[PDB]
Amino acid sequence: PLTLTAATTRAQELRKQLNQYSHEYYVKDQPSVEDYVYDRLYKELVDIETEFPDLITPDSPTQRVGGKVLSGFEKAPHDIPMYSLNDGFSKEDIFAFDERVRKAIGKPVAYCCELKIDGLAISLRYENGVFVRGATRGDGTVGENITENLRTVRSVPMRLTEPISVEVRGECYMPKQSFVALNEEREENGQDIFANPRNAAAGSLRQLDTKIVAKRNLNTFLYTVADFGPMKAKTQFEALEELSAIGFRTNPERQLCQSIDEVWAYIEEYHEKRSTLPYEIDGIVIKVNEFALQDELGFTVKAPRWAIAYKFP
Ligand SMILES: NC(=O)c1ccc[n+]([C@@H]2O[C@H](COP(=O)(O)O)[C@@H](O)[C@H]2O)c1
Ligand SMILES: NC(=O)c1cc2c(=O)c3cc(F)ccc3oc2nc1N
After folding, report:
1. b/e map 83-95, b = 16+ CB within 10 Å
2. What is the distance between the alpha carbons of residues 307 and 236, in angstroms, rounded to a whole number?
3. Hey, what domains does the chain have and what are their CATH numbers?
4. Which atom of ligand 2 is nearest to the CA of 82?
5. b/e 179-218 (16+ beta carbons within 10 angstroms → b)
6. Do 223 and 240 form a contact (C-beta atoms < 8 A)?
7. Beta partners for 309?
8. Is the Cβ atom of 306 under 6 angstroms away from ligand 2?
9. Cβ of residue 223 lying under 6 Å from some atom of ligand 1
């Protein structure tokens, strides 16, 4: 019925259409077509790949189910170190942070505020638009190469919107809903439950069998451009927008604040909205918006001087 020639062509058509649908459903959290439309096309692709396995590609949506089983994780170095954040706990801590920033820069500074997603910090590297490496923060200079596991995280693009080479960083986490379902499953199988979604995400990414990881329903939020490649963003707020543009999932609750007072209002706003979110957050991350100014402030041994994480009590 279908020759190798026709199938080879049709397979690419399906991957493109299905990947667009997944981008809308998983990355934008806003599907355009009904599930049955996706399922019908997905099945057609599975049928083609089953008949001619040589047509299976790394960016085919059928690969999301995983299948590879590792013996262990390779070391994943971070030539551009993955620092951690300095903490703040009181309104005075946040204002003190602002005072230090102003003292160093010499003028009022705008801040890009984001929710502190409670999960595992990860780094994603793309080459010519192709996903080539996924890694945990680990100790900051060396983490674990969890590329295969991240291929199963539905919101992680296997091929970017543009064939660019960049390295980005964000959080990989488990939504409350999935955390609950998972613990119930572990209770059913006589296993120890996970204390919180953070530990659930960490344990999930430590699994060597990708098939298991694929079922953990992990998700992502990207927030840092480590290796810009051709990206043009000059501020953090611009970077979040650009991360979205090239195909990554970004958190929609960020806000650019012109004053420390607006920053505190943001903190209080989301401090009370906290329980309404589908994911857990342990605070707010306040970042100097201008990259030029972030560069001026630099980093201590432990963290950047241009950011602070307000931790919820
Ligand atoms: N409507 C859509 O665009 C869309 C995209 C991806 C997955 N889904 C749904 O997500 C579920 C899981 O499918 P996948 O594992 O192929 O991502 C299915 O129920 C599927 O229909 C829907
Ligand atoms: N958990 C988070 O949602 C979150 C975490 C970090 C970091 O750990 C982080 C570490 C750095 F060295 C620099 C910026 C950062 O920005 C961050 N931004 C976020 N939104």
Report:
1. bebbebeeeeebe
2. 11
3. 1-64 (1.10.287.610), 84-118+250-313 (3.30.1490.70), 120-249 (3.30.470.30)
4. 12
5. beebbeeeeeeeeeebeebbebbbebbebeebeebbbbbb
6. yes
7. 87, 285
8. no
9. no
Ligand nearest to the CA of 18: 1
Resolution (A): 1.9
CB 254 within 8 A of CB 237: yes
Mutational pocket test of ligand 2: of 80, 82, 117, 223, the residue with most ligand atoms within 8 Å of the beta carbon: 223
Q: Is 42 in the pocket of ligand 1 (CB under 6 A)?
A: yes
Contact call for residues 126 and 160 (beta carbons, < 8 A): yes
| Unique residue bearing structure tokens 């058509």 | 13
Annotated binding site for NAD(+): 35-39, 84-87, 114, 137, 171, 287, 311
Q: Is 91 a catalytic residue?
A: no
